[PDB]
Amino acid sequence: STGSATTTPIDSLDDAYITPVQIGTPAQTLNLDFDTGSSDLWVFSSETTASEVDGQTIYTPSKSTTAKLLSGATWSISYGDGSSSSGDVYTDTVSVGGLTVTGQAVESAKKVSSSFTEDSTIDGLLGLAFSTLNTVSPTQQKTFFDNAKASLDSPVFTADLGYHAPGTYNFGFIDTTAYTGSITYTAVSTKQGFWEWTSTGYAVGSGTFKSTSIDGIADTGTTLLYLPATVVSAYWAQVSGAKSSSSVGGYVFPCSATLPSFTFGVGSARIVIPGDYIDFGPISTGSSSCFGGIQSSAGIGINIFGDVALKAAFVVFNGATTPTLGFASK
Template sequence: MIFTHFFAIISLVTASVALPAAVPGIITVPLDRVDSTSDLKNAGSFAARAANRYISRSVETRSTLPSKLMPRQVASKEEGFASIFRRQKGDDGINTAKNVNITVLQGGALRMRIDVGTPPRPYGVALDSSSADLWLASPDCKTCVGYEPYVASKSSTGKVSDKKFVVAYNEGSLRVDVTGVTDDLIFGGFPIKQQPFAQADKIPKGFQDVPFDGVLGLAFSAHSEQKAPPLLQSLVDQKVIKSASFALHIPAGKKQATMTIGGIDPTKFSGEIDFVPVDNAAGQWGLNIDQIVAQGKAVDVGTKKGILDTGTSVLLGPMEDVRKVFAAIPGSAEMANGTFTVPCNQDNSFALKLGGKDYGLNGVDFLDEIFSVAGPNNANCVAALSGDQKIKSWVIGTPFLQKFYTVWDLSVPRFGLAKKVE
C-alpha cells in the first residue's frame, strides 16, 4: 500500500452471477515480472513493506530466532452481472472490453504501458489501486534517475499548468512534488483526450531505482490530489467505452498478467462472480470484512475495515489483530518488525469472509513469494501476512488478489471475485 487514508465502511451484500457467453473482439496485452537491484532492510516495517511492492528486500530476524531469510522456491445477482456485460457489448460504435497485458514486478506489483502525447511516447507505470493520481517524471527532475521523462514541449497536445501540489504515499512518509499537466494519452489501446495528470519535479528515495516511469492510481477521483477523473471515467465520458470497470487476472508465479478494460473476459474465470459493495466515500476501494478466519475458525479482531491495494506485495493488518491470527496457527512465530513465520509443510489457512462467503489462502498461497526461513530442517516459511502498529485497517494486497479473478466496477461501485482460470 502506497497511500493510506482510512475511513468508515458500509455493510456488504453478496450477489452471485452466472457466467455469460464469451465476448468477441477482446484483445490481450501482457505484463512481465521484473526484478530490481535495490535492497531494503527491515522489510517487515510498514513503510518498507509498502515500498517493497517495487523493490527487492531482505528482512532482519530477531536474535532469538537463529534463522536467516533466503529466496523461497515456489514449493450477484444475475441482473447485476449482466449490467457489466451489457455495457461492454453495444452496437453504437462504442468499444467493447479490451485485454491489456501488464507486467508483474518482483513482489507482486503490476506495471503496464501507457502512451502519452502527440506523437505518443511509451511509459511503464505502476498500477496502484490505493491512490488516484497519475504522474510521470519531469525532464527537470534531478532525483528521477532512470525514469523516462515526460516532456510537454515535445507534444503538440501537451499543456503545463502553474498548479503545483504534492502526491503523498504511506501516510505522508513518501511525498512526490508535482506540477499539473494535461495531454492526450492511450490507455490499454483506448485514446483519451486532454487527460489531467502530473509531472514529478522531485521524488523521494523510496521511488528511486525502480522499474517504472511513474505511478497510475486506480482509485476514485475523491482521492485524487488533482481531483482529476480516473482514466476509466474519462473513457466513459468521452464515449470510448461503456463501462467504467476493469478486471485483473494475475497468474501466481508468472511474469504476465492481464487487465481487461471496460468489462470482463469470461475465458479468465469459471463459475460465478460474487460482488460486494465498495465504500468509496474517501475515494478508495474500501471493503467491510465480515470476519477474519484462521485455520477455519473466526478470529476476534478489533477492526474489520479493509482496503484493496494492487500495489502491496503482502497482506497487512493492525499488529494486535495479526498476532491473534497467528496465535490460531500452530507452529507460527513472530519475527522483527511485524513479520511472522509458519511451518512450511503445514496446511496453513487464512481467509477473509466477504458478503457471507470465505475467500481463503491455503498452503503455499499463504507463504511469502520472495523469502523462506532456513531454520531447523528448513521448516519455517515467511507468511504473506504482516502486522504494523501504525495502521488501523486491513490492507488486501497481491497475495489475495492474485488468488482470484477480480472485477473492479467504479460506476456502482462494487468489487467482484471469481474462481481464476490459470
C-alpha cells in the same frame, strides 16, 4: 470502448506490477504501477531532478504535440509507506491497452523520494481510486478511469493479478473466461475515497471459518495483506517459529516452513490465498528468516487487501452510479 493490458510483476516476489501506458503524440510508453489506492497519474519526466532519476523511462512533454501545460497546477502526494513525489501538470493523450483518453492530467514529477528513485522498473503511478483523492491544486483532476468511464461499454475495470506471472487489467468489460464459478459483489463506501468494503470473515488453513466484519480497501498498489492484529496473530500462530520482529518491522517465519492458506469472506463466498502467496522471501540476502505476506494493520489506521489477497481473485471494480466490488475465484 474497451481496453486490455497485461500487467507484469517487477521482481520475483511480486513486490508490485507494471503495466505499459502510452502517453503523448507520438506515443511515449512508460511502465506504470496501477494503484487502486490512490488517484494521481504521475510520471518520471524531463523535469525530474536529475539526481533522482536512476534507470526509469521519462515522459518529455516538449516532444509531445498534444501536451499542454495545465497552467498554475501543482501536485504533491505522500503514500502510506512514507514515499512521496510532487511536481507540475500537463494534459495529454493517454492510452491503456487500446483505450484512449484525451485531455488526461499527466502529473510530471519534479521531485521523487528515494524509494521511487531506487526502483528502476516503475516509471510512475496510475491511480484508480476515486477522483476525490486526486492531489492536483488548485483544480482537482480526474483519474484515467473517471475520464474514460462514459465511453466504456460498461463502467468497470478488472484486476487479474498473477502469482509470479503476468496478469491483466481490463477496462469496460468483464472477461467471463478469466474466472471460475460466479462473481460475488459486495458494497463499497467511497467516503474515504477508496474502494472500501467489508469482508465477512476469515479462516486459517483448514480451520473453521470465523464470521467477523473486516472493513478494508482493495489496493493494487500495496504489496501485502494488512489485517487486524487479532487475525494476523491467529494466522502466524499456525507456523512453527513465526514471530513478530520489531527490528525487521513485522512477522517473520523460518524459510523452511510450509505456510498455511488464508481464506477471506466476500459475502457468503470465500477466496482462498494459497500459503505460497504469503512467502516474501529472506529478510536480507541469504537469511533463513523470511518475511510474511500477512501483516498487522494496527499502525496504519485501515485494513488493506493488497496484492497478496487480490492476486488470489478476479476482482471487478464496478464504477456504476453506486460503486461495488466483485470477487471471483480463478
